[PDB]
Amino acid sequence: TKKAVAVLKGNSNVEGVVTLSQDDDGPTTVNVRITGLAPGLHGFHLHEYGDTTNGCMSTGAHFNPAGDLGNIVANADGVAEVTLVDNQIPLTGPNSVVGRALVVHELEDGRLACGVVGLTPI
């Protein structure tokens, strides 16, 4: 019943799209497609601020109302495509992640790419 999207870019080759969906206070479904990554595990995190005025560093710290989505895996071609299901990522209420940032890291759980979490049509 509620949806969000983040377009990831940064000072690097890495880019992609993340779509988030949640019904009520239920679990949040995260659909990840990120390209240009070095093969292997990459930390993938909610960060506190949807502030990209200074690249990905201006998004501040790992976000804790939880914010740890774990690793995503890039394949031999630098593509990470995966669907995660997380309970600690609300799109509504006081702890909404709307307007915050999604950040993908150089190393496993160095901010290669990020995007503001924005509203998108239901």
Site membership for Zn ion, residue 100 (CB under 5 A): no
Site membership for its own copies, residue 79 (CB under 8 A): no
Site membership for its own copies, residue 5 (CB under 8 A): yes
Residue 109 touches which of Zn ion, its own copies, none (Cβ within 5-8 Å per kind): none
What is the spatial distance between Cα 10 and Cα 37, in angstroms, rounded to a whole number?
12
Q: Name the DSSP class of 37.
A: P
What is the spatial distance between Cα 117 and Cα 19, in angstroms, rounded to a whole number?
9
What is the spatial distance between Cα 30 and Cα 39, in angstroms, rounded to a whole number?
21
Site membership for its own copies, residue 106 (CB under 8 A): no
The radius of gyration of the chain's CA atoms, rounded to the nearest angstrom, is 13
Q: Containing H/E element for 8? A: strand 2-8
Site membership for its own copies, residue 7 (CB under 8 A): yes
Of residues 21 and 100, the one with the C-beta less far from Zn ion: 100
Q: How many residues lie near its own copies (CB under 8 A)?
A: 23
Annotated binding-site residues read 45, 47, 62, 68, 105
If phi over 0 gives left and psi between -120 and 50 gives alpha, with beta otherwise, what is residue 70?
left
Q: Which of 2, 9, 33, 62 binds Zn ion (CB under 5 A)?
A: 62
Site membership for Zn ion, residue 45 (CB under 5 A): yes
Q: Which of 11, 13, 75, 120 binds its own copies (CB under 8 A)?
A: 120
